[PDB]
Amino acid sequence: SKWICANRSVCPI
Structure with missing residues (x-):
């Protein structure tokens, strides 16, 4: 599953 x-x-957003 992804982060x-x-x-x-x-939080690479």
Whole structure:
């Protein structure tokens, strides 16, 4: 499964 974004630290959006 792809990432779900935990926070600004991990959110390539």
